[PDB]
Design a protein around this ligand. Structure first.
Ligand SMILES: COc1cc(Nc2nccc(Nc3ccc4c(C)n[nH]c4c3)n2)cc(OC)c1OC
Ligand SMILES: [Cl-]
Length: 127
């Protein structure tokens, strides 16, 4: 297949915590972006086979998507909020690497990223 194995959503050896910040990332940030009208391309790994993107995984070596992030949050996969924020950042910046200006996906990513940043600016202080 053109598609690599998807990023893991669990691993017994991953060190894991629950924090109020991670809870906010699931209950507010992910939830808000998941229900957005532009979420749909980002709700699962890029399927380069079905979508006829034979160079996608030639260019993008650290893929990420919100389906993966959602499952990671549900599985308490993260050690801290920063690890989760980094996955969102990877998701957005992969688009800015792969796509060109004006592409549908890049305009959608930009809108979701603006909203992400607005929600992350209200991340609670860790208790
Ligand atoms: C095709 O490019 C990406 C698709 C996706 N993801 C995705 N998931 C399900 C359906 C779907 N259809 C779909 C979207 C857009 C288009 C354009 C334009 N032409 N045909 C298209 C079909 N797409 C994610 C991506 O990056 C995160 C992409 O950009 C590399
Ligand atoms: Cl992915």
């Amino acid at each position: 297949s053109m598609n690599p194995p998807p990023p893991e959503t669990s691993n017994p050896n991953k060190p894991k915590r629950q924090t109020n910040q991670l809870q906010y990332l699931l209950r507010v940030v992910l939830k808000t972006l998941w229900k957005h009208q532009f979420a749909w391309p980002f709700q699962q790994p890029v399927d380069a086979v079905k979508l006829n993107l034979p160079d996608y995984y030639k260019i993008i070596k650290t893929p990420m998507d919100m389906g993966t992030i959602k499952k990671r949050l549900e599985n308490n996969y993260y050690w801290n909020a920063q690890e989760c924020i980094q996955d969102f950042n990877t998701m957005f910046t992969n688009c800015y690497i792969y796509n060109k200006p004006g592409d549908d996906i890049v305009l959608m990513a930009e809108a979701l990223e603006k909203l992400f940043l607005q929600k992350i600016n209200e991340l609670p202080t860790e208790e």
